[PDB]
Ligand binder design. Structure first.
Ligand SMILES: CNC(=O)c1cc(C(=O)N[C@H]2[C@@H]3COC[C@@H]32)cc2c1OC[C@H]2c1cccc2[nH]ccc12
Length: 112
């Protein structure tokens, strides 16, 4: 069906975001932000819905996502959290921008 086909395209995108090709700028998004470890004691006051690629992978593997839009909402939530919390001149924001470029251009090629 169409939903399964579109979810395969999403899974392809997810595999690419986690691939060695993008590791130089994708790595801050591989696991949940460890606020305590990074000394970010305001992170969970500012970010109400944390998201990261390991959580997206778990949800895909668990068949949590019912459509491509639900998958895209979680990937974009992850980038939005980064843009909300971090100063715009921080390296992690430059890395988010680069990984979101990879995501948006491939997401746009979604099969209809
Ligand atoms: C999604 N990840 C994050 O939002 C994130 C934030 C901070 C972080 O410290 N953010 C505070 C700035 C100033 O105060 C508010 C905000 C640090 C890191 C983050 O992921 C990996 C970690 C990291 C450690 C070493 C070098 C790095 N280069 C780029 C990131 C990075």
């Amino acid at each position: 069906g169409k939903l399964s086909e579109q979810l395969k395209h999403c899974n392809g995108i997810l595999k690419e975001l986690l691939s060695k090709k993008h590791a130089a700028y994708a790595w801050p998004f591989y696991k949940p932000v460890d606020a305590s470890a990074l000394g970010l004691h305001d992170y969970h006051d500012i970010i109400k819905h944390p998201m990261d690629l390991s959580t997206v992978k778990r949800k895909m593997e668990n068949r949590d996502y019912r459509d491509a839009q639900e998958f895209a909402a979680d990937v974009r939530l992850m980038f939005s959290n980064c843009y909300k919390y971090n100063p715009p001149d921080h390296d992690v924001v430059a890395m988010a921008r680069k990984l979101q470029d990879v995501f948006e251009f491939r997401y746009a090629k979604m099969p209809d």
